[PDB]
Design an enzyme around this catalytic site. Structure first.
Site, PDB file in Angstrom:
ATOM      1  CE  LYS A  30      -4.070  -2.351   2.021  1.00 44.34           C
ATOM      2  NZ  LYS A  30      -3.454  -3.675   2.356  1.00 44.34           N
ATOM      3  NE  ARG A  31       6.304   0.401   0.611  1.00 39.81           N
ATOM      4  CZ  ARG A  31       6.276  -0.379   1.693  1.00 39.81           C
ATOM      5  NH1 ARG A  31       5.199  -0.432   2.472  1.00 39.81           N
ATOM      6  NH2 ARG A  31       7.336  -1.120   1.999  1.00 39.81           N
TER       7      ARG A  31
END
Lengths: 250, 250
Positions: free
Chosen positions: B84-85
């Site tokens: 979840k960058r």
């Protein structure tokens, strides 16, 4: 000493946040590069902001390098891990433990997209700070400037932060320097929160006029390239620190 | 050998994504735990999804452990790094290089909050997929995702962007929870062709709402339901077959 206890002590002298974004090709060289920049700038620094991605890039040795660099920051100066994390439950807990306990950073940046219980695992540490993305780049328009009733999405984020999210009084916002009208709008919704303000090196007076609180504080102005790549990083930090304070004083 | 080439081949047999979320207390034990689960489930797995936070937790040894676990996944089965960058410029480039080249994952999860140019550094790899957060099932989903933008929810606006302007490389997917099939159907209406990564199974209702016209386009993630099952091998077989029975039905 909480993050904000440390920051408020530093804020008596400086609002400058020094980005630690190493250009080095190896983890070992990255450590030395960051250590030198810390040595040159700490007298004028309110905070340091290591780049989580740049350290991850080095793989195995990257973690150790990040830990070493954080250790090299003088006592009393808080560290914001710019990791922009956001997940839930055990996963979010693991990110928080890594940042706050293992790496011993004093603060983290986080995405608001998954909402309150994605943020709670970070915010539950009362002595740490969480800077939530609010207004940032050209992609800002896509989501941040969408209208949700009579306000922009970024304003809705601000209203939650200066509001129900701030249980431990440890919530801040990430609000960019390149958009002073938006900066002022966020400050109007959230008059007491600290803003982490990147992008000055991408107007100083305009940003401070828009973003400073009534007390003449509450903006942590991040600079990376302007310091790291300076002919004299110490002089650059001193000059920036003094320029900001002159505006605060006036 | 793109992510979607691998996934389309696996989808002939399965839509089951197996989460790799080790409960082990050391990095070495975590690797063994993941290897055991891979051995038990690979015949029925369309993908594996390692938990980036759980591996980061182990520090120095963590990265190497994650690398080893990814390498352990059989050739032909794609790996989605659940990281979840979301960041910009060189920082996002660094996350992408780390996930796609250093760790050799085939896909990553990402936050939409910073918009198009925060996603481009991931999406510029045509052989890699980017699953963008859209609708999650946690309570915080109310804060931003379910806000009204015109005549639709924010999550519908994200879905439209993803199916439309973002999908230049045909490598964009969406993260959409299973807990609300009404929302899942709304997303499928806005994004008729994109793959959904679907965590947290409500199996039949989810598939009815989210499957494409071809009987595909949903990747059903299971973590605890497999890892903590008395017989994970039989569990994966049963889940795979149950999904397919629904797909086959007219």
């Amino acid at each position: 000493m909480s993050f904000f206890d440390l920051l408020n002590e530093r804020a008596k002298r400086s609002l400058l946040c020094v980005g630690l974004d190493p250009r080095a090709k190896t983890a070992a060289a990255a450590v030395e590069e960051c250590k030198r920049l810390i040595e040159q700038t700490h007298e004028y620094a309110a905070a340091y902001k290591p780049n989580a991605a740049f350290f991850e890039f080095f793989g195995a040795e990257g973690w150790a390098a990040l830990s070493e660099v954080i250790r090299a920051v003088p006592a009393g100066i808080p560290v914001v891990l710019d990791a922009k994390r956001g997940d839930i439950a055990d996963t979010a807990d693991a990110y928080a433990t890594s940042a706050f306990k293992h790496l011993n950073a004093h603060a983290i940046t986080a995405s608001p997209y998954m909402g309150s219980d994605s943020l709670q695992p970070f915010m539950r540490y009362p002595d740490k700070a969480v800077f939530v993305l609010c207004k940032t780049n050209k992609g800002s328009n896509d989501l941040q400037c969408l209208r949700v009733g009579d306000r922009y999405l970024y304003e809705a984020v601000a209203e939650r932060a200066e509001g129900p999210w701030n249980v431990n009084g440890n919530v801040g916002l990430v609000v960019g320097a390149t958009d002073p009208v938006a900066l002022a709008r966020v400050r109007a919704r959230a008059p007491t929160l600290w803003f982490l303000v990147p992008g000055i090196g991408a107007s100083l007076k305009a940003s401070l006029d828009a973003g400073l609180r009534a007390d003449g504080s509450g903006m942590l102005i991040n600079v990376s390239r302007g310091l790291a790549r300076a002919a004299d990083p110490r002089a650059a930090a001193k000059e920036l620190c003094e320029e900001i304070n002159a505006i605060r004083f006036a």
